Symmetry: D2
Subunit: 114 residues, 4 copies
């Protein structure tokens, strides 16, 4: 099944934040309406916050997260969760290797902001 | 129901990261072993990271997040999500006012690390 | 925080299913258009499906779950989860007692159908 | 990533319930310690409960859900959610066809019982 694609409410500011847990340097691309809007990268085995940004979901509300290590796409897993019918998280894990820890890059999307 | 309390696997390192979206200065306390292990304070209406750290869940595995503003505890909401039976998120929102956006401090806990 | 209230897409059919795990008879009430639209009752400590029904979220999309045990409202906990940006669950737990298992009546809402 | 595999607490009773929303007869297999423990089959486009059963997670706690239609495995999506650090859901969707509604068989696992 497709993973790492989320329909947000249109024209909405959201936070996107990436964490690294791997020997390899991660690259996280964040697309809004099918165009790259942010790119984060770093290397940490201790959950470094390699990037954080505020983006706008735009007219489509379509947000996609892609993860790669030195040109190789990682395997994604994802889901969305809503607390008290108000607070939204879109969650991505990724695996670059064989251990299936799926934390090699972790991406959290949150809205609303403000 | 109790909110912001999570039983992690014992003796396990975890990330805790806090984001602010409020006029109020947010104070986030993270307890392990029922004693404060990290405290983050900051202000933003743009989802700024007001703290990030790695902590150890200790012998009980019990982790608690508390949030207060102007000395008053905020109302918490939380849940845990597990992706591909491996990647864990414990998520907390909080409300310091009337709009019920529950984003006034947002806390992301994630494990495993490494 | 408010629990057991969910904003579904308007005019959408959804399943609602209740399970019982308690010494006491559970009453589950499901509201749409702020009016009770399905009710289920039963006593089980073996996760009986005390009722399942398909309902329509109507023009507001507002769906509410209430649980009580012989008149006394239970304490609710809830969240919503979305898989592959498509499949939706709204989840309710409830506590009628002191043990905080929150399984005394469990309610699952799922959409889309068909 | 692997989907439909969950590590429950060992030797614990859990509920497993399957719903159908498809033109085809759905077959759901529920494995405990890599051996099929329960199987549900049925057809509905109106979210009928095609099976429900209480099972024991046994010494390993490993539970796996597989879904097929007339011998063809469906594509699975899944996650786990925990409310108030107590109530657990393991959630499965499946897609048997081209529309990607992922509701063709929906499987809900819940614990603890009682
Ligand atoms: Ca890995
Ligand atoms: Ca890793
Ligand atoms: Ca607020
Ligand atoms: Ca706010
Ligand atoms: Ca109880
Ligand atoms: Ca109970
Ligand atoms: Ca389908
Ligand atoms: Ca279908
Ligand atoms: Cl909720
Ligand atoms: Cl999973
Ligand atoms: Cl997803
Ligand atoms: Cl919680």
């Amino acid at each position: 099944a497709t993973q790492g694609v989320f329909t947000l409410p249109a024209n909405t500011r959201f936070g996107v934040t990436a964490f690294a847990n791997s020997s390899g340097t991660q690259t996280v691309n964040v697309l809004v309406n099918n165009e790259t809007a942010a790119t984060f990268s770093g290397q940490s085995t201790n959950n470094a916050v390699i990037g954080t940004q505020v983006l706008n979901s735009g007219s489509s509300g379509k947000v996609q997260v892609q993860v790669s290590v030195n040109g190789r796409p990682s395997d994604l897993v994802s889901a969305q969760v809503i607390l008290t019918n108000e607070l939204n998280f879109a969650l991505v894990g990724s695996e670059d290797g064989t251990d299936n820890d799926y934390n090699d890059a972790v991406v959290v999307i949150n809205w609303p902001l403000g």
